[PDB]
Design an enzyme around this catalytic site. Sequence first.
Site, mmCIF file in Angstrom:
data_model
loop_
_atom_site.group_PDB
_atom_site.id
_atom_site.type_symbol
_atom_site.label_atom_id
_atom_site.label_comp_id
_atom_site.label_asym_id
_atom_site.label_seq_id
_atom_site.Cartn_x
_atom_site.Cartn_y
_atom_site.Cartn_z
ATOM 1 N N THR B 1 -20.429 25.383 -5.546
ATOM 2 C CA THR B 1 -19.019 24.962 -5.599
ATOM 3 C C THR B 1 -18.120 26.170 -5.713
ATOM 4 O OG1 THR B 1 -19.699 22.906 -6.686
ATOM 5 C CG2 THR B 1 -17.370 23.519 -6.877
ATOM 6 N N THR B 19 -17.243 22.289 -1.859
ATOM 7 C CA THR B 19 -18.619 22.625 -2.226
ATOM 8 C C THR B 19 -19.630 22.118 -1.211
ATOM 9 O OG1 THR B 19 -20.258 22.501 -4.025
ATOM 10 C CG2 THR B 19 -18.958 20.497 -3.566
ATOM 11 N N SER B 73 -17.713 15.772 -10.438
ATOM 12 C CA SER B 73 -17.036 16.346 -11.595
ATOM 13 C C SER B 73 -15.896 17.278 -11.198
ATOM 14 C CB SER B 73 -18.022 17.101 -12.482
ATOM 15 O OG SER B 73 -19.069 16.241 -12.945
#
Lengths: 336, 194
Positions: B1, B19, B73
């Site tokens: 990422t 990413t 996330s």
Amino acid sequence: TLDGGAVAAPDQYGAKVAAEILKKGGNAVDAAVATAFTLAVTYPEAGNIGGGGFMTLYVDGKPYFLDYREIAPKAATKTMYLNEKGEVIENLSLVGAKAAGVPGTVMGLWEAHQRFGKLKWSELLTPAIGYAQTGFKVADQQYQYRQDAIALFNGKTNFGDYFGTMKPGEVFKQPELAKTLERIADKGPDDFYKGETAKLLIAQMKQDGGLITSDDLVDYQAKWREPMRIDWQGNTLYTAPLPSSGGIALAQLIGIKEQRAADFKGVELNSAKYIHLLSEIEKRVFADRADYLGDPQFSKVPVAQLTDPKYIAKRAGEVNPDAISATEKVRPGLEP
Amino acid sequence: TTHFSIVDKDGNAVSNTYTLNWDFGSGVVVKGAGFLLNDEMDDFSSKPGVANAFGVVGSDANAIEPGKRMLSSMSPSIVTRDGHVSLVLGTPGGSRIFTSIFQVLNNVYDFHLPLEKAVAAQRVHHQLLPKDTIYYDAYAPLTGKVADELKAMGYTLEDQGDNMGDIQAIRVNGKALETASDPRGRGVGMVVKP
């Protein structure tokens, strides 16, 4: 307005390109598009056109969010990474063609630019094409990540055919990637999802046993969403909503920390008490993360319920400032 | 990422995290085209209660389904005040991304640390499972008295084997701009005058 523009980029090449675009009169989105394509060349460990991502924006006083996260192929199944006896197959979701979702980055950069960019599309790719044609110098840590990756891949892929010649401090060129970026500059996302690049992607799926099809690529769409908004102390944080867990996580982290201000009063940054209190909050955040969160169009996710100030207050009460809460007793907060 | 942040002279801002998932993704390159394919599928729950490569679990909500986006996330962020951009930031780090951002925000807004110090500061991570396990990186490892005190409380301390993030941030202070590139990585920041 401001004294100027600014960029904070993960390498010198993204930084340089963003700055040149701002100097040419491009806006933050023009610069972001050129930067993202640049890092797809100079930062291949993460910068990409074969992955996905999220963009949070503030344009003319209004917030926006763009979801270009990958999507599961049509052929995906709930147990596709399990053997006939129900056990997870080592690295099948991590290495090789079956680990890939349908890429979204090229579509995302297109949609962001078409809506908000000021400059001509194709010229935003010229920087990246240059770095692919004439090369960039591989960083030491980058090469180390390369070593670790090629050892993990353990000969199962064609990674070494393309990135095996990387050497620290030496100029690394990517001629096929240059042509791919030239096609994207000339044709737009159509090249990637409908055209020559799309065909090359499909051929690799068949060669390697992957699942992505032409119909997968044709049906991919980036999605504009309302960003997560979090207010505290007169500040307004805009961040990623679902399918990111970070928005709800930050809404709960900040909201609970604020409720527990008395426990944080006087405690030094990164004292054991500070770290313990953060862990105590993170316990509850991840309990909710595991039980409720996913693609918001594939289940009815109770976002409002998980971010209501009264829920925040209840969960903040669970924080134990003097000792570790029992892990097995940290439950999903809406569980009756 | 990886993450980058941009502000332009009109006060518009972009915070972008994207990413392949793990380093170089799936390790598969599209022959003839030259780009790597992601291994993003591991962010789904492959089996209820079984952790993925970041240690996070799931069940129905994040289970694999055709056409479904896998839970992330990644948390590209923009803070504003009075309708104007004040802070742009984001970071890699998988399940550590939003806890790292949380810590940077605490450092800036609660501890009132200057931006470079708020970004350089030690960050740690806990995520319920593995039980009572706190992660740290070799850049700023948990050591000395604080480590003993945490160990004594019942916590397991673990070097996670990679830097805990790579924050790329821009602070807007009235009309003035400031950048910070995490010392953990090789990032670069520039203020760009008209």
